[PDB]
Amino acid sequence: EDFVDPWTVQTSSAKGIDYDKLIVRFGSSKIDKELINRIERATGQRPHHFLRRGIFFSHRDMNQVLDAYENKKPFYLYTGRGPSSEAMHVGHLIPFIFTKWLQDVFNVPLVIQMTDDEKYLWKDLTLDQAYSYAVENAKDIIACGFDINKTFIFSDLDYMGMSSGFYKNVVKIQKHVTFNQVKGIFGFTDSDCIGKISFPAIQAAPSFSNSFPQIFRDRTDIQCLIPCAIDQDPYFRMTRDVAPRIGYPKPALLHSTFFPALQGAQTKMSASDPNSSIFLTDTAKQIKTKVNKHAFSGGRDTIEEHRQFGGNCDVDVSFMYLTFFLEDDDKLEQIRKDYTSGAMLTGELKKALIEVLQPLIAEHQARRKEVTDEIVKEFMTPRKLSFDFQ
């Protein structure tokens, strides 16, 4: 009942998908209180709200990452973006917001893959468009605050032709994965182009440190941690499988839930449905309108009934959004209590969310405007990142 994969995301329950059942089906492990406390201990920092609230709820070998970090051994962060267009919605920002926190708390180098080739193979795009979207989307990623001296954002199309180690790993991986394997993992068929069939190796490749010689200089032992939306897991479930078969360490994973579509947690927000998403370029006006008109309500139909019986936070999309963006834990709790008791009407809850998203988006736009051509260029230039590994 919780179908999930690299592109599509379906579920049939207003409360969202059953992530506990998904963990089991994926074979990953749940992020428990014990692990959350160990992360706090290891770092000396209070865990990000995404972890406290179960937004990042699943993982693979995080224990290993914590071991390595506790023993002063290095590890690096790796995440990515499919640049399907210049238009990005708030849902896309979840993993990046978290990765930025990860990079600050652990203080480690970050690698961000821009799959312009992926999007070229799958969508009706020109190479220039695809590449252009990677560069434009990179500005939105840089707007999240990543340290220019600790992070390399790269275009597949560009980097493939300027790395003495990337393509090499891509081939090693290509040899250790069959068509049957990828047909079962991603659902490919005989009619798909050969580019799609072999693509997974591209996305698997950045999991190995020697893919970035200008960063790790031939070392093949640095632990890799991949924070991503749960639906990306099949790429790395595959990656973890081949790693050993080719003498490389398995990458660790940190999974996040889906950011809800405006009409209900049954679907994730997707540009493939603009009415379901809030875009990073939406005006203050459009944000208010989308929330007021499209945000599914867990409250009662009439205000009288709402006062009498109170609302249901478990299916209310507006409350769900506050869960992702309202940092103050007490403020959120009060709203939960007041909404549940009917003390707060959905219209007010709605107003509350709007007052949170508008500044968030307006601020992101302000930051994005600050990334100049020279800045994007540097971020996207293979180079050494203030960190010595040898």
Ligand X SMILES: NC(=O)[C@@H](N)Cc1c[nH]c2ccccc12
Ligand Y SMILES: Nc1ncnc2c1ncn2[C@@H]1O[C@H](COP(=O)(O)OP(=O)(O)OP(=O)(O)O)[C@@H](O)[C@H]1O
Q: If you write DSSP's letter for every residue of 62-95 in order, what string do you get?
A: HHHHHHHHHTT--EEEEEEE----S--BHHHHHH
Q: Figure out which of the listed residues 84, 99, 210, 256 binds Mg ion, where binding follows CB under 5 A.
A: 84
**Tokens 């679907």 sit at which residue?**
267
Q: Figure out which of the listed residues 103, 232, 239, 318 binds ligand Y, where binding follows CB under 6 A.
A: 232
Cβ atoms 154, 107 nearer than 8 A: no
CB of 29 to ligand Y, least distance (A): 20
Longest dimension (CA), the chain: 68
Q: Figure out which of the listed residues 226, 349, 354, 361 binds ligand X, where binding follows CB under 6 A.
A: 226
Q: Does 244 bind a second copy (CB under 8 A)?
A: no
The rounded distance, in Å, linking the Cα atoms of 86 and 72 is: 40
Q: Does 79 bind ligand X (CB under 6 A)?
A: yes
The rounded distance, in Å, linking the Cα atoms of 310 and 334 is: 14
Binding partner of residue 231 among ligand Y, Mg ion, a second copy, none, CB cut-off 5 to 8 Å per kind: ligand Y
Name which of 134 and 215 has its Cβ closer to ligand Y. Answer: 134
CB of 214 to ligand X, least distance (A): 19
Q: Figure out which of the listed residues 117, 140, 231, 316 binds ligand Y, where binding follows CB under 6 A.
A: 231
Here the tokens at position 75 are 């590890």
Half-sphere exposure of 251 (CA within 13 A, CB side): 28
From the list 111-119, 240-248, 254-262, 358-366, the region that binds ligand X by CB under 6 A is: 111-119
Q: Figure out which of the listed residues 85, 129, 132, 365 binds ligand Y, where binding follows CB under 6 A.
A: 85
* Three-class secondary structure of residue 198 per DSSP: helix
Q: Does 44 bind a second copy (CB under 8 A)?
A: no
CB of 9 to Mg ion, least distance (A): 12
Sheet holding 29-30, edge to edge: 29-30, 56-60, 252-256, 223-229, 75-81, 110-114, 151-155
Name which of 82 and 206 has its Cβ closer to Mg ion. Answer: 82
